[PDB]
């Protein structure tokens, strides 16, 4: 029963404008009306977004907060929107292209959300396919304008997007298969809608082939070879992922030291698995021990479930406030192989509980759990589930901007890392195998800090990892030493960090900042850890600067 304020009204109106400007955002919100439409990716599209943003800030400028909730809203919006305008004004937004989260991927990805149960559904898919050309044309218009302004993505990233988009457009690629395999009730589409689908998918194929040609012929020849984006671009991207403007040299130095600590810890844990064992030697023992393997998905679900239910029942009303509807975290098998464990939060009304989904790679039916205990806490309780479910629980106290728009990577990923560290400190990882798995994920995330900042700023390589200053080649060998992952995933992560600067440290740096907030509050009389967790999580997703000011 907290009534909406004038500030919430501005926040809600801005949200409606965002929905109006980006119809893809409405479909990803479940809002009907604009199922076939894309945002305007052209420069005029970007100017319109920026203008709406500038007008929203102006509207907020003379509005005093009516309560603490308003003050957080003002702070979060001023931070997020102000940063958005700094990035737009920098000119680099127009050049946006990378291997993972840029318009070429986004324009294709939206199709995966669309239902396929009625003729009208298939008309929507066909109609969206038929709008892929205009989306791509506007995107090419922004890339071309940035190019004329001497701002072009690294050659590596352009080459990757030419590869990815050529598969989308190929004879047997995404859009072709969409039209060829379409069904309704396990039967072919009626001919009239099928023809709409064939025409639309055909246009989508041609548009992705044109982006390919443009990239190849106009952009690639002027693309820089150098991947590093440099200090000025880096600091703005870093802010986008963390919501704090960190000291980059200081953060880099912290990350190098933190990686060294985590390796030292792994060496200690190795000796707890087998006296005097190297990390690699201990890992063969864990990975070859019949006791650390589970057979079949039923037993796997049972294992996840017990861990989750135990964490809830032990932490409830001790370290966290967990309302009854949040105590359920259903552990499940992913219908598809999303390549790891993922979390889906509860419905707004809590009729669907939070769920955790383990993706089983094709043909796999035995499961090693030592490395995934920590992941259960990260993706589940007290990580993502408590954070996401608490924000959702407090939704009546949160305007639509806060609920549906404002989201900061360092905040939510930092929290899941905080959560793993808390479970270490509370004695959940005493088994050396489980401990090792936690350290592995921390080590990989500490390596991200060193790589991202070191490479993009061309900093001195730490003597443990090389000499001179960082180059992408040196960075690749460094990742290979610190990430226990497949060859193909290593190559992907490498490419990602190079093309998406600022995001990779958001995990460990988010953890650091969360821990700094808690450490400060701990210095004071009456600190109460449960009360801290409640106040913080109630706020929802905000930048780390904003969170610190809401809490200190």
Site residues for Mg ion per CB under 5 A: 257
**Length of the chain in residues, anyone?**
552
Q: Beta strands 354-358 and 329-333: pairing type?
A: parallel
Q: Beta strands 293-295 and 366-368: pairing type?
A: antiparallel
- CB of residue 341 vs Mg ion: minimum separation in angstroms? 8
The residue with its CB nearest to Mg ion is 257
CA distances from 83 to 7, 50, 237, 326 (A): 19, 11, 9, 34
- CB of residue 534 vs Mg ion: minimum separation in angstroms? 22
Spatial separation of the C-alpha atoms in residues 533 and 547, rounded to whole Å: 12
- CB of residue 384 vs Mg ion: minimum separation in angstroms? 6
Spatial separation of the C-alpha atoms in residues 415 and 242, rounded to whole Å: 12
- CB of residue 376 vs Mg ion: minimum separation in angstroms? 12
> Could you write out the three-class secondary structure of 381-436?
CCCHHHHHHHHHHCHHHCCHHHHHCCCCHHHHHHHHHHHHHHHHHCCCCCCHHHHH
Spatial separation of the C-alpha atoms in residues 245 and 388, rounded to whole Å: 24
**Of residues 412 and 501, the one with the C-beta less far from Mg ion:** 412
Give residue for tokens 């479930």. Answer: 305
Complete DSSP assignment for 124-149: HHHHHHHHHHHHHHHHHHHHHHHHHT
Spatial separation of the C-alpha atoms in residues 394 and 2, rounded to whole Å: 11
**Of residues 374 and 399, the one with the C-beta less far from Mg ion:** 374
The C-alpha R_g of the chain, in whole angstroms, comes to 24
382: cis peptide before it, omega within 30°? yes
**Of residues 40 and 440, the one with the C-beta less far from Mg ion:** 440
Annotated binding site for Mg(2+): 379, 384
Q: Which two tokens stand for residue 9?
A: 């009204």
- CB of residue 251 vs Mg ion: minimum separation in angstroms? 14
- CB of residue 132 vs Mg ion: minimum separation in angstroms? 30
- CB of residue 416 vs Mg ion: minimum separation in angstroms? 6
- CB of residue 58 vs Mg ion: minimum separation in angstroms? 36
**Of residues 118 and 257, the one with the C-beta less far from Mg ion:** 257
**Of residues 32 and 335, the one with the C-beta less far from Mg ion:** 335
Q: Are 442 and 482 in contact (CB under 8 A)?
A: no
**Of residues 227 and 420, the one with the C-beta less far from Mg ion:** 420
Spatial separation of the C-alpha atoms in residues 40 and 44, rounded to whole Å: 8
CA distances from 35 to 38, 137, 412, 491 (A): 9, 19, 29, 35
Q: Which two tokens stand for residue 316?
A: 């409830």
**Of residues 153 and 341, the one with the C-beta less far from Mg ion:** 341
For residue 311, report the phi and psi dihedrals to the nearest 5 degrees: -60, -45
**Of residues 196 and 508, the one with the C-beta less far from Mg ion:** 508
- CB of residue 379 vs Mg ion: minimum separation in angstroms? 5
- CB of residue 399 vs Mg ion: minimum separation in angstroms? 25
Q: Are 169 and 104 in contact (CB under 8 A)?
A: no
Beta bridge partners of 355: 330, 344
């Amino acid at each position: 029963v907290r009534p909406k304020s004038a500030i919430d009204a501005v926040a809600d109106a801005y949200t409606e404008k965002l929905i109006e400007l980006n119809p893809s955002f409405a479909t990803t919100l479940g809002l009907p009306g604009h199922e076939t439409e894309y945002q305007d990716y052209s420069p005029a599209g970007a100017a319109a977004h920026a203008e709406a943003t500038r007008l929203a800030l102006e509207a907020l400028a003379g509005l005093e907060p009516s309560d603490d909730v308003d003050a957080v809203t003002l702070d979060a919006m001023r931070e997020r929107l102000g940063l958005e305008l700094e990035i737009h004004q920098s000119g680099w937004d127009a050049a946006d292209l990378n291997n993972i989260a840029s318009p070429a991927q986004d324009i294709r990805a939206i199709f995966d959300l669309m239902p396929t149960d009625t003729v009208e559904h298939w008309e929507h898919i066909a109609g969206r396919a038929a709008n892929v050309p205009g989306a791509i044309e506007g995107y090419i218009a922004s890339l071309r304008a940035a190019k004329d302004d001497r701002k072009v993505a690294a050659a590596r990233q352009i080459r990757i997007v030419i590869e990815q988009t050529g598969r989308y457009a190929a004879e047997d690629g995404f859009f072709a298969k969409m039209a060829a395999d379409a069904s309704l009730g396990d039967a072919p589409l009626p001919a009239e809608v099928q023809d709409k689908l064939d025409a639309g998918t055909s246009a989508a194929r041609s548009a992705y082939s044109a982006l390919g040609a443009f990239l190849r012929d106009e952009l690639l020849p002027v693309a820089p070879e150098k991947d590093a984006v440099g200090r000025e671009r880096y600091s703005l991207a870093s802010r986008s992922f963390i919501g704090a403007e960190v000291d980059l040299e200081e953060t880099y130095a912290w990350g190098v030291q933190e990686l060294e600590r985590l390796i030292s810890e792994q060496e200690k844990v190795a000796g707890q698995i087998k006296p005097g064992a190297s990390i690699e030697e201990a890992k063969s023992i864990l990975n070859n021990d019949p006791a650390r393997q589970i057979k079949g998905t039923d037993a796997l679900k049972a294992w996840m479930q017990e861990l989750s239910d135990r964490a809830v029942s032990e932490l409830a009303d001790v370290h966290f406030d967990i309302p009854d509807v949040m105590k359920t975290l259903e552990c499940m098998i992913a219908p598809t192989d999303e390549g790891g464990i993922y979390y889906t939060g509860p419905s707004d009304d809590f009729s669907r509980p939070g769920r955790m989904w383990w993706s089983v790679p094709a043909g796999e039916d035995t499961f090693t759990t030592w490395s995934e205990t920590t992941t259960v806490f990260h993706e589940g309780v007290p990580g993502h589930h408590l954070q996401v479910a608490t924000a959702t629980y407090r939704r009546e106290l949160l305007n639509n901007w806060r609920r549906n728009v404002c989201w900061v990577s360092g905040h939510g990923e930092g929290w899941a890392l905080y959560a793993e560290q808390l479970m270490l400190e509370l004695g959940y990882l005493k088994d050396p195998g489980d401990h090792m798995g936690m350290l592995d994920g921390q080590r990989m995330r500490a390596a991200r800090v060193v790589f991202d900042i070191g490479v993009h700023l061309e900093l001195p390589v730490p003597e443990r990892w090389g000499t001179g200053t960082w180059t992408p080649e040196k960075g690749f060998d460094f990742l290979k030493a610190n990430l226990d992952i497949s060859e193909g995933q290593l190559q992907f992560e490498f490419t990602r960090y190079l093309g998406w600067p600022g995001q990779a440290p958001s995990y460990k740096v988010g953890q650091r900042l969360w821990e700094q907030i808690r450490a400060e509050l701990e210095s004071r009389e009456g600190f109460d850890l449960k009360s801290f967790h409640s106040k913080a999580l109630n706020i929802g997703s905000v930048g780390l600067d904003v969170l610190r000011r809401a809490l200190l």
